[PDB]
Design a protein around this nucleic acid. Sequence first.
RNA 1: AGUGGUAAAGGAUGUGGCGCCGCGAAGACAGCCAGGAGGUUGGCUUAGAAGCAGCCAUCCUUUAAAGAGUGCGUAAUAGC
Lengths: 37, 134, 153, 302
Amino acid sequence: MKVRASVKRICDKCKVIRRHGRVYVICENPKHKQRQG
Amino acid sequence: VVAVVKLQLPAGKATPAPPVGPALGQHGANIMEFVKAFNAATANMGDAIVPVEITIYADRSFTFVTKTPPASYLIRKAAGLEKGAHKPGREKVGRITWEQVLEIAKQKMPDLNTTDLEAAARMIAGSARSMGVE
Amino acid sequence: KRNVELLATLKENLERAQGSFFLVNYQGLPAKETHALRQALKQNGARLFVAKNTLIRLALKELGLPELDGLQGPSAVVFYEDPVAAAKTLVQFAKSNPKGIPQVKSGLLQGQILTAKDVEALAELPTMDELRAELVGVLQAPMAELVGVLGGV
Amino acid sequence: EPTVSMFFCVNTSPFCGKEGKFVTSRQILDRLNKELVHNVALRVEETEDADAFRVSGRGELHLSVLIENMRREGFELAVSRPKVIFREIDGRKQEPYENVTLDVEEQHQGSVMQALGERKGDLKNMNPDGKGRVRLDYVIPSRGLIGFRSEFMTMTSGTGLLYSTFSHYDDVRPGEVGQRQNGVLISNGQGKAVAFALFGLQDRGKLFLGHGAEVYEGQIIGIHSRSNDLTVNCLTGKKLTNMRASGADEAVVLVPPIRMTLEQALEFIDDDELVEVTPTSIRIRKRHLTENDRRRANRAPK
RNA sequence: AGUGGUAAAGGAUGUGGCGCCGCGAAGACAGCCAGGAGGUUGGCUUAGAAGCAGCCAUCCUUUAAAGAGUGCGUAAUAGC
């Protein structure tokens, strides 16, 4: 999943991953694919 | 073969429905309807957490003997905890006499971790709190 | 802030209530199995802080403040520190030896120990599972000050 | 004597007239008895409604064979659908209750105890054994048994048999034994499916028919995103047209079924949605077409 | 970052900077080891709570110091 915005993590322990100016949240639940870069 | 499992039934009744029980009569045990045999035993034990609790031999069998009530339950067993009849509390039939807790054990303080020369002062403060006697 | 006034003011208090404590690495025991060797401590002993599983640096270094001759017997690995001072250390040593020995692969090994004032030797702490009821030093005096008439018989 | 039961009736609806030449009761009856000859696992029973029958077959799919063969012959009929009677009688459903475990294989102990326990399926007793399985008699009533056979076979995967009967006429208790989730989308009148009509409220769940698909009242045309039921409408699809003027724009599309099966729509019912079938089509409407008419029977307490 | 070399709302374990919080060398945190303690065992529901099913409980003893048990869960329970 992605969104040019939003992202305030989620899966209770959803990870704030720094990758290529790529605000990408990584978790253990596909539901959180947080791609906002 | 051989290997039994742990279990905790009630202290008074004997009817073996869901406690004696898909538990014993499965993972490892014998026969069922442990109720009829439970009444002839739990009858003299059941009103303060009594563990024995539930096993199964090569018969299987059986009732008789027991353990008693868990610590707290056995410590404030002489209360009534008649409450809980609605939500978590909370009105009518609450106290159980400041001395009662001590008088109730007193004896009701033999089988316990390591040892305890008092289950009405320090033991009660704990269990009693779980019920409502904080 | 923060380790000093708290806990540290009790580690030397419950371990200084006398002069005859020990040390044993207790831990390799399940909550249930562990609550048996410790909870029963009251039986073989008497609440004697038989090493309530202190830790390190706190118990070892603690010797400084109190100056218990520095129980330099074994600070590494687990550190229980059997408080034989706060109870009745002497012959009960056995009540704790067989228990944490005849059950499971080495229930709980021993460490250091102070004999009234001296340092209990590692190899000279176990074999003494039964604290010499003083009879020992008395089993070679009166029966050794009147036995030249027994070979006198 | 196998099991299952699919009440039968007459498409006494409005759409005429209609399938082929056999929709009334007479023609139907002739077929019923005709089946009570060859069929060995079939058990035709007579209900109250002159247009209802309790077709007691064997397997959930079994009843399908007879239904599927009915169409190709030219005879539309709804499913199941013979309900029960709340008696007797002062009163509150005194039907019976009989359960039976279906070993197991402890690979369903938690997959079967849920449905039963969730549907009042009181486990009067779970006779276990040393083998590996374990019976489970759940005094269930005819109200919480329907369709159960189907989903059941999907839980234990065939390896799971258990019937019942009754222990004593109850009163249905106080709770409903379903009643199915995701309300069914009903129509508001006969006409035809309008792209501009089915476009609006399309994300509110799924759709059944298409366009110009011109159904009628009571006939379901999809399921609601929730449990509540409604009766939308459209043809209309409106409205045309121009000028002026042009040129932009927009051109909504729409997805199709979602259609089928039967077999995939029948068990979809719950209250009274006679799966009106035909020798070339299969519809599904509520026991009460007219919306305001449904409220007449419900009417709840007290 | 190529911002240089147009942009806001707003988003962020960016970069660097405060002026500040944790240091029980009674030697720290992520990494480690093992125990994860006995009354903890209904209150309803007990088909099950006997923390890991819903309407609150806020006590006790007891030591690794103590989970009125933050969490994977079903039939309780049992395991992490």
